[PDB]
Amino acid sequence: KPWWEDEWEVPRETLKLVERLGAGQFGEVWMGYYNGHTKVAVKSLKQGSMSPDAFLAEANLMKQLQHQRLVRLYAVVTQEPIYIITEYMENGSLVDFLKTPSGIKLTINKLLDMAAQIAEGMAFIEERNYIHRDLRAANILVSDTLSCKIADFGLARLIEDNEYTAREGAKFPIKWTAPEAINYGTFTIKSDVWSFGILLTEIVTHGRIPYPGMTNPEVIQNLERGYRMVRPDNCPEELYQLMRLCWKERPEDRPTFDYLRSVLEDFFTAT
Numbered sequence: 001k002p003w004w005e006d007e008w009e010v011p012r013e014t015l016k017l018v019e020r021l022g023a024g025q026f027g028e029v030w031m032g033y034y035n036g037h038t039k040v041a042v043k044s045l046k047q048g049s050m051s052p053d054a055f056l057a058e059a060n061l062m063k064q065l066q067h068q069r070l071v072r073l074y075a076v077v078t079q080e081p082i083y084i085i086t087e088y089m090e091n092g093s094l095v096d097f098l099k100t101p102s103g104i105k106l107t108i109n110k111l112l113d114m115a116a117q118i119a120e121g122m123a124f125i126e127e128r129n130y131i132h133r134d135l136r137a138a139n140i141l142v143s144d145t146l147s148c149k150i151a152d153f154g155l156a157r158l159i160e161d162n163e164y165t166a167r168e169g170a171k172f173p174i175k176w177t178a179p180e181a182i183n184y185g186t187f188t189i190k191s192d193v194w195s196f197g198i199l200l201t202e203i204v205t206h207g208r209i210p211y212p213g214m215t216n217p218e219v220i221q222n223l224e225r226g227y228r229m230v231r232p233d234n235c236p237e238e239l240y241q242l243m244r245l246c247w248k249e250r251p252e253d254r255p256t257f258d259y260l261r262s263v264l265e266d267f268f269t270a271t
């Protein structure tokens with residue numbers, strides 16, 4: 001739909017950037033205000049750094065996937081510099097939150113709580129025929145009420161025919177990404193279920209890196225033997241067995257996101 005007609009397009013005067021949160025090869029991420037009053041987060045694309053079309057394909061995807069457990073597109077400014085304006089998450093990224101004095105003191109109870117909200121997010125992604133493909137603590141954001149939401153939809157995709165096969169010179173974080181996706185580039189909701197498994201190790205160890213003290217060739221080599229990640233320090237056995245289902249060998253055997261959600265919900269009231 002054209003920019004002079006798109007419900008999401010906002011004139012650039014409505015926006016005021018107050019505090020750079022991040023900078024990288026492709027642009028900055030700011031905290032600012034929409035029409036004076038509403039905290040928003042603003043992503044600006046660095047001109048020249050990659051295609052406006054590719055940068056905006058992210059917003060368009062978020063036009064289709066709206067949910068309370070997913071970070072909400074708030075508006076776009078489709079003239080240069082292009083802006084993606086989304087809903088603002090106060091406690092920032094999960095990987096970072098878990099490390100702060102506030103996060104340090106959270107009981108295992110609340111960690112299960114949190115792990116359940118992230119699965120609810122995914123159950124809706126799964127249900128609408130989308131995949132995430134980049135599911136990891138660094139991509140869960142946390143709200144001023146200590147609730148969580150799936151963020152970053154740069155790699156997310158719609159999937160009528162069950163699979164998305166990626167480019168072939170194409171690399172993904174080895175520790176978070178399922179065997180089949182690393183080996184064939186074939187992704188399914190079941191490869192996200194795998195990363196969810198890794199993500200639960202981040203939640204429980206307060207953000208520490210998966211597979212403590214192993215390189216990536218050690219990690220691939222170990223998985224091929226039939227090994228899985230060594231039990232995290234202070235990891236309830238239920239949690240660990242739950243991660244094991246996420247780490248099953250065949251995609252089809254790995255559990256649904258609705259099943260994970262509910263399992264995590266039982267783990268939580270039990271505490």
Ligand SMILES: Cc1cccc(Cl)c1Nc1nc2ccc(N3CCN[C@@H](C)C3)cc2n2cncc12
Binds near residue numbers: 042084087088096
């Ligand atoms: C701007 C944008 C574009 C595309 C997709 C999303 Cl989910 C978002 N929203 C956010 N993107 C962020 C990207 C990075 C960071 N951080 C930079 C690295 N370190 C911490 C402080 C968070 C925070 C974001 N955010 C917060 N509240 C909302 C957001």
